Symmetry: C4
Amino acid sequence: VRIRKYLANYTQDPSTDNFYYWTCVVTVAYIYNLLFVIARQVFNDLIGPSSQSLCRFYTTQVECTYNMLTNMKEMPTYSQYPDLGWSKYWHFRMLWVFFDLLMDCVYLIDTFLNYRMGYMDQGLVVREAEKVTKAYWQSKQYRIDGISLIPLDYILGWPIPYINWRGLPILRLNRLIRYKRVRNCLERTETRSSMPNAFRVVVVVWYIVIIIHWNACLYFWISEWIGLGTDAWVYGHLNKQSLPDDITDTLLRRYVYSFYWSTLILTTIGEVPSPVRNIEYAFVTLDLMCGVLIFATIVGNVGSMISNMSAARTEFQNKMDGIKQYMELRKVSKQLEIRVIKWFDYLWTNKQSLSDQQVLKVLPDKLQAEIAMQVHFETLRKVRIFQDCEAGLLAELVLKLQLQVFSPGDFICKKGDIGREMYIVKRGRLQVVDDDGKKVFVTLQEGSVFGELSILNIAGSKNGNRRTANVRSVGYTDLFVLSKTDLWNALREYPDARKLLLAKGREILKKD
Amino acid sequence: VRIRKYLANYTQDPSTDNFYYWTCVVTVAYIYNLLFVIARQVFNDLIGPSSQSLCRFYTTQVECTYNMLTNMKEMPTYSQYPDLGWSKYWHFRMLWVFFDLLMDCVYLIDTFLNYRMGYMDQGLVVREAEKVTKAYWQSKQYRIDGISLIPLDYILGWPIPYINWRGLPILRLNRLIRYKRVRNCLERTETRSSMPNAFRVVVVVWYIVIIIHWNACLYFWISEWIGLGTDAWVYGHLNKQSLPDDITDTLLRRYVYSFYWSTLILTTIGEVPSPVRNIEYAFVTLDLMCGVLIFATIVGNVGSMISNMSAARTEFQNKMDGIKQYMELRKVSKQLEIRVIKWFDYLWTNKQSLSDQQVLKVLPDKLQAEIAMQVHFETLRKVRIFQDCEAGLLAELVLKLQLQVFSPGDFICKKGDIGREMYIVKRGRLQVVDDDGKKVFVTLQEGSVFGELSILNIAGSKNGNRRTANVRSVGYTDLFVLSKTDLWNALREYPDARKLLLAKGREILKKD
Amino acid sequence: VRIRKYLANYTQDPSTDNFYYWTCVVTVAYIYNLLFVIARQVFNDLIGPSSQSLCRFYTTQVECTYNMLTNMKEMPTYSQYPDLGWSKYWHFRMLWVFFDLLMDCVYLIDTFLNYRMGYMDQGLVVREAEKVTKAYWQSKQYRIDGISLIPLDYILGWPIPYINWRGLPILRLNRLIRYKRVRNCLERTETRSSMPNAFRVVVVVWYIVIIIHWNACLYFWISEWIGLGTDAWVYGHLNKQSLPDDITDTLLRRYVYSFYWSTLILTTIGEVPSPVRNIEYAFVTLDLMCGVLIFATIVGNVGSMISNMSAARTEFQNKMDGIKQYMELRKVSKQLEIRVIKWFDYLWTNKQSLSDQQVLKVLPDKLQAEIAMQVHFETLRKVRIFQDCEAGLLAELVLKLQLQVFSPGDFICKKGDIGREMYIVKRGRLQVVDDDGKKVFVTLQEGSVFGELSILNIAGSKNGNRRTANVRSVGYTDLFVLSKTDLWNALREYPDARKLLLAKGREILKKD
Amino acid sequence: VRIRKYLANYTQDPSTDNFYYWTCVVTVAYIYNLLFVIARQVFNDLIGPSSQSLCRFYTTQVECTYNMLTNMKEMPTYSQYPDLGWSKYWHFRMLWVFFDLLMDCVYLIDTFLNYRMGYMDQGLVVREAEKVTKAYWQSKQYRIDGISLIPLDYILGWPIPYINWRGLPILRLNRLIRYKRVRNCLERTETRSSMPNAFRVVVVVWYIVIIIHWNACLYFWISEWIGLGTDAWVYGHLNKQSLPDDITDTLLRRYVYSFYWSTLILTTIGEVPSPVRNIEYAFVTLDLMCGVLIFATIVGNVGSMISNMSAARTEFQNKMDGIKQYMELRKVSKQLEIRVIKWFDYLWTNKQSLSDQQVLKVLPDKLQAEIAMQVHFETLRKVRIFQDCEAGLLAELVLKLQLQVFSPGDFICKKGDIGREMYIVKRGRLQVVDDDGKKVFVTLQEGSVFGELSILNIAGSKNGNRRTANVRSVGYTDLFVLSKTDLWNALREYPDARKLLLAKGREILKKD
C-alpha cells in the first residue's frame, strides 16, 4: 500500500544533493561499461578461457602448462570446449553477470527518475506527476533511455554451447549512450569542489587512461585478427619485445604489453617494433597521427590546468617586474625603490593584491553587498555613523569603499593638502601628530573615521577645503577610502547621518 | 540562337550561392591536381608500368611474378616497352586523360566566369558585360588564368613511343596557381558553417595529409634518383623495413612505406633507417627540421582549435574559481557560499553567463536592436507601455535593458531602500509581500512592470524616492533592468508613454 | 690635402641610410667570425691538412688514398709536415688571411665611425668633432673597440713551423664582442621591413643553424679530444653510423655527420649511438637538456611568429563564431541570421573589420589627423562644408568621424525616428524615398552630407528633433558618422560653417 | 649572565635582512637533505661499501679489483663485513655525521627562531616574548617543528654491527617537512632580485635536476630490488648499455647511468632498453607518463619564462606591424609612412613606448607622485610656476602630466588652431616662428612653458580661444601635456599660481 502510492506520486527534483550523489552512482556504472565491455570483447579470457590451448610438446599435442607458454617456438592452437567452459568458469561468469545486472538496475532506476524528473518552468521546479510524465514523453528522451537498455547482450553476449555461439560482449556498447548524465556529474562535481584544479587534473588523467586502454584493446584486436605470432609487429612469439626469453604468455602479459604499446604509440615515443604488412602500416600511421593530434590537445591542457594553479602569483610577478624595470631605468633612488618593493612584499604576504575585482565584476550588486557586509562585519560594527543611523546608508556606502594600503611612515593627511576623500581604518594604527615632528595628539585604531572635515562643507571655520591636522601611519595601515561624491550622494539621501557628521565636525572645528 | 545570346550577355555575380557551389567544384579540381600530378610524376606506374621488370631467375632474365618480387636478393632491371605500354594500359591512361580533361574544362569554365565576373562599384555589383570585361582585361587576371591553362602536359606529359619520350606529368603543376579560388572557398565555407571548429579541424587534417603525401613522393623521388636498393636508407631490398621477409614489392608497397617514412620524419619520431650518404644526410636533416618547424605550427594550431571548442566554459570556470578562492580566504559563512555557488550553477545551466556582450560589442546598433527585438518578442509583447504607444520608445529602450538573475529568496525592492531602477519580468515569478513575512498581496508574472513608482517623480505622495512595497522573488527570476536616466531620456522624448506611466503610478499611489 | 681635412673634420650621423647599410656590412663580418673561427679551430683542415695521414697498408705505413679511408679497420696516424703544410696549402691559407684582414678592416672602419659618432643632445644630433670625440673617450666604448681588435690571432693563430706551433684559431673569438652593432642592425632591419614576420622567421632560422653548427663543432672537438675511433659514440670507424660501409672519411664527412648528430640531439630525436664513457654521458646529458630547454624556446617562438601572420583573421573568426553561436541558441530567424552573416562577409572582403583602432590607439593625434586626412582625401574633397570654410574645422572633425557599414536594404533615417548623428557618404549610394515604398526623390552619392537637419536646432519648422525624410541604402554603404556633440563643438568654435549649415537647412525646411 | 638574558628576552623580526639570509641558510640545509638522504638510501656506498664484493676469479672467490668489475660475465656476490665496514670508512661516515649534525643544528636554530618569532598585529610586529611564545604554542607550529626534528636517523640510520642492522638513511626524510621556509626564501629572493627571470630560470633548472636525481634513485632502487644483472632492463652486465665493453662497474657508473636513464625517460626520448618483466613494464609506463605530464608543465614554463624576457619588444612589434599593415592597404604616401616609421624607431631607441602605465596602474597615487616627482626632478626644477608657489600645485599637477613625443618638423601650435592644452618641455628644442616660414622669434628649451595663453581666459585680447603664435619643433621634442580642465582645477584651488599665470599672459598679450 505504501510503496505503490509512493512510486505512483513520486517526482524527482534535479537540484538536490541526493540527486547529485545519484548521478555520481550512474557515472560508476558508465565507467564500468566503458572499460569492461571492450575489455571482455577483446580479451575474452576475462570470463574464462572457453577453450584449451593445446601446445605441441616433446611429439604430440597436450594442454599447455605455464612452462610450455614460455620460450615457445610456436603459438598454441585452441580447441573449443564442449560446453564453452561453463563448467569450469561459471563462478567468473556469474560474477560478471551479477555486475552487469547491477549496472543495468542502476540504468533502470535512472530511467525511472528520468521518467519522473521535475523541470524548471518559471524559476520553480514542476513536481506534478502528470506534467513531468507528459514532458518526458514529448521530449524524445525515451529514445535515449530505450536504446541504452536493449538487453541484447543477455541473449547474444555470452557463450551458448548448444548453438556453438561464442558470445558478443560488444553488444553492450549501447549502454555508452548515456554520456549526458556522466558529463553533468563531472561539471557539477567541479562546480562543487573546493579544489577545482585538482579535480580537473584527476579527470584528465582518467581520460588518458581510458584512451590508452581502448587503444590497447584495439592493438590486441588487430593482432588477433591478423593472427598472433605471425609477424614481428603482432603480439606473439616473433615480437620478442612482447614475449622475451623466460616470459610466460598469460592474460596479464597480453594486456600489459598492449597497454605499453599504446602508451608508446599515443605519446609518439614509438620504441615498439615496426609494421611488417600494409594493413599494419595503415593502422600504425593512423594511430600515430591520432596520437600526435590527440595527445596534443590533452597534454597541452594539462600543462595549462597546472598553469592556472599559480596565475595570481604570475600576475603579481609581472606587475612587480614591470615596476622594478621602470625604476632601474629612470635611476630612482634606492631608498624609494626599497620602499616600493617592501610595499609590494607586504601586499603579497596578506593577499590583498587584486582579489576583489572578481567578486566586483561578475556577481550581482546585492550579492556583492551581502558578501562585503559579512566579510567586514567586525570592522564596520565599530564605525559610529554606521552603527546608529539608517541601514540603507551602510549598504549603499559599503559597495563604494575602496581599500588602500599605506606604509609605516606615510602621511595620509597633511595640514594643508586638499580634502577629497574620507578614511575608515580597516587595520593598522595612525597618529594625529603635531605639525612637523612628535607631540602625537590622538591615536586612531580600527573603526575610526577621519578625513570628513575637509569634504564636508561646514561654514564655521576658515580652511573649508584643507586638512585641519596631520595623520601619520604608524605601521602598515589598510583604510577604506570613500570619495567625496559618494559620501554626498549617500548623505543627501539620508538626513540623520548628515546631521550627525555635521554636528561632530562642527564640535571638532569649534574646539580647534 | 538562345545559347549565343545567353553567353553573349552573361555576367556573373560573385555573391550568389550557385557561385559558392561553383568554387566548391573548383576546389575539387584543384585538389585533384595537387595530389595526382606529383603522384603520377613520382610513382609512374599509376598510368601503367610502361616497362617490364625482368628479374633474374634460377640463370636467365625473365619477367617478374609476384613471387619473384618477394625476398629478392637484388632489384629487377627494367626494359622499356616498344610502345611504352600503351597497348596494355590504354584504359588506365584514358581514364587519367578523361579526368585531366574534365578538370581542365572546370578550369576553362572558371576562366570564362572570371572574364565575365561582376564587381562591386558602390556597394552594388556591376553586371554590364562591357564594364566587367574591361575590368577583367585591365586587372592582370588573364595572366593567372593563362599560365594556369597552358596545355603543355597534353603534348609532353604522356609517353610518346616514337620519340622515346617518357612523359613529364610534372608539367601539369601550372594548374596549382589558381589557389586563390580555393582559399576563398574555404573561408566562405567556414563563414557559412554551423560547425566552424569542426570544419577547421577537417581542413587542417587535409593540410597534414597533403604535406605527408608530398613528402612521401619527395622521399621516393630521391630514393629512385639515388637508386633503389643501393643502400639501407633508400627504398629497396637493403632497407629491410621497406621490404621485410615475405613482403612483395608492389606499387602499393612503395607508397605505403613512403607515407609511413614521411609520417615518422615529419613528426620527428624518426624510427626509420639512418642515412648512409652525404646527400641523404642533407635531405634528412633538412626534412627533420622542416618537420620540427612545420608540424610545430600545425600541431600547435590544432590543439588551439580544439581549445576554443570549450572556451566559454573555461572563462566561466575561471570566474567561479576566483570567487570560491576569495570566499574561502575571507571565511564567508557556508550558507552564503552555497547561495553564491547555486547562483553560478543556475546561471550556467541556462547559458546566460556572458553571451550578450559579443553581439553588443561588434554588431551595429540597428542589427543589435533587431536581434534583441526578435529574441525577446514574446516577452516584450506582454509589456503594456510597449504594446500601446510610440514604437520608437520600444526600440530606444530595448537597446538599454540589462538582464539580471535573482535567487529564490532575494528581495528586489524593500520598502524603504532607494529607487534607481525599474524592472520588467523576463522569467520567473515574484510577490508583493506584506512588510516582514507573508500576506502576499499580488503576484508578478512574465511581462509585469514594477519599480517605476520610485524613479518617477510624482508629486502626489510623501516617499518620492523610496520603494512603496516589498517585492520578493519566488524562484529564480530574470529581470530586465532599466536605469532611471535611460527611462527619463526615452520619456522626455515620448510624451504619451510618460503620461501613461504617470497616470498609472498616480492611481496606485492614491489607492495606497 | 683633401683626404686629410675630410677625415680630420668627419663625424657620423647614426640615423642615416648609409649608416644602416654599414651596420649591415658589419653584420656580415660578425657572421663570418661567428661561423668560421670555431669551424677552423675544430676542423683544422679548413686551412690545409698540415699533416699527412699515414694509413697502414697491405705491411707498412703509407699516405692514405681515398680508397684507404674507406672501410678502414683502424684510424690513420698523423705525421706532422716539416713546414706544417705551408708549401702545399699557402693558397688556402692566403685566402683565409685575406678574408680575415678584410673583416678586420671592416672592424677598424667601424671603430673609426664609433670614435667619430654623433649623438643626440636635445633631439638633435651633435656633429662637432671635439664633442663627439670627447663623448667617445668618456663612454668606455674604446674598451669594447680595443678588446675586439687585439690582433692576437695574427701571431698565434696560424701554423708557425719553426716554433712547431700548431696554431690557435680560437684566439679570434674576441671579435665576437661587437654583438651590439649586429643586434641593432637586425632590429632596424625588421623596423624597416615591409615583411616583418618573414624577416623574423629568417632570423630565427639563422639562429638555429648557428646553434647546430656550434654544437657540431663541440661534438667533433670532444670526439677528437677523447680520440677518434676509440669507442662507438665518438666519430670514427667504430661508430658505424658516421662511417658505414663504402663511405670515405673526409673533411666533408666529419662535418656532415657532426651537423646531423647535433640536429638529432638538440631536437631530442636522439637516433644516434649511445654514450660509452662517463665523460660522454655527462656531455650528452647536458647537451640533451640544453636541447630540450633551448629548442623549446626557439621552436615555440617560431610557431608563435607563424601564428601572428594570421591573427586579424583569427580575431574576426572568434567574433563571427561567437555571434553565430549566440544566434543559434536564441533561435533567431534564418533571414536575419543570413543578413548578419552576409554583413560580416562583406566587412571581411573589404578589410574594414577593426583596422583603425591601432592607428587611433598608439599614434599621436596630429599624426592620426594627417594620415586620415590623406587616406580620405578624395572623399573629403567633395564634402561642401569642408571644401569652403576654415580648415581647422576639417581637422578637428576629421579626427571624430566614425565609419559604419550598412546593408543593401537598411534605413539610415526613418521619418520619425530621432536625430542624434549626421552622415557623410564614404562609399555606396542612398535614396531619399517617399514614405513607405518607391517614388525616390533624390539620390546621394559619395561626398553627400545628410542628417544634419535633426541635430541642428533650427527654430523654423515643427519637428525639431525628428528626421524630415527617409534615407534607404541601395547597396552596401560606408558612412562617416559624426555625433551631435562633436558637430556642435566644432560649430561653436567655427561660425562660418555654422552659418552655412543653418542657411542650407533653413532653405531645405522652407521648401519642405 | 649576558647570554642567558639575551636568549631569555630575544624575539625575531621576520622582515629583516638578516632573517632573509637565515632563510637562505635554511634552504641550503633543506637541499642537503633533499639530495643526499635518498642518495644515501639507494646508493649505500656513499658512506662506505660495508661489504666486500667477492668476484669469482680464474676457480675461487676473491675480492674484486677494478679489472674484475670490467667485462664481467656475472655480478659479484657481497659478503657483509664483521663490523659493517666501520673500521675502513669511519672517516667517510664521520664526515656524513658532521654534516648531518650541522644541518640539524640549523634546524634547531630555526625552531628556536620560530618559537620566538614576531608577528604582525596591526601593521606592527609584536616583539614581546610572552606574546610571541603564546602565539607559537597556539599556532600548531610545534607539530611541524617536532616532526621535522625526530632524531630517529641517529639511532636506526647507520650501520650497527652488533644488531646486524644495515641502516635506514630514509628515516631522515622527516626533515623534508620544513618546505615552507624554503618556499618563502625563493619567493623573497625573486622579489628582491634585479634579474627576476634569470633567477626563475635557475630555480626551474634546479627543480629539473632534483626530479631527475630522485628518478635516478628510483630506477636504481627498483633495479637492485629486482636484482642487478638479472635481465636486460635492470642495471647490470646484461644491460650492455649500462656496462659496455671495457667499462668498470663503479659507484660513479651506477649513478651516471641512472641519471642518464632518467633523463631519457622523463624527456620521453626513451632510447633505453625496453622492460622485460611485468613489474618493469608497470614502472616504465607510469614513469613515462609522469615524464610526459610533468615535463610538460615544466618545460612549457621554461619556454614561457624565456618569453617574457622580451615581451615589451613583442608588444611594440605588434603595434608596429599593425600600423604598417594598415598604411600599406590604404596606400598612404611613402613620405608620411617613413615619418611614422621613424617616429616609432625613435620612440623605441628611448624606451618611452608604454613604460608608465604599469606604475600608473598598480601603485598608490602617493607613491606614483613621489616616483614621478623624483624622476622629473631636474626638469620640474626649471618650471617657473612650480618653483615659486604652493607645493600642492606641483604634486596635484605632476600626477596629471602626459608625455608626448613630436617629430623634427611638427607644429605644436598653429596660429589659429584651438587652445585645449598647455605644454612643458621635457626634452628637445622648439621655435616660435613667424607665420609661414623663418624669422624665428624665440627659442624654447627644457623647462619652458607655452600654450597657456589660449586655455587661460584673459579678457584682454580678441582671440580668446586661439593660439597667438606658431611653435615648431626643431628636433624630436618630449613635452608634458596638461589639459585645460586639470590646469583649471589646480588653479581654482591655488590662487597665487593663477595670479602669476594670468599676469604673465596679460603682459605677453599686451606686448602682442
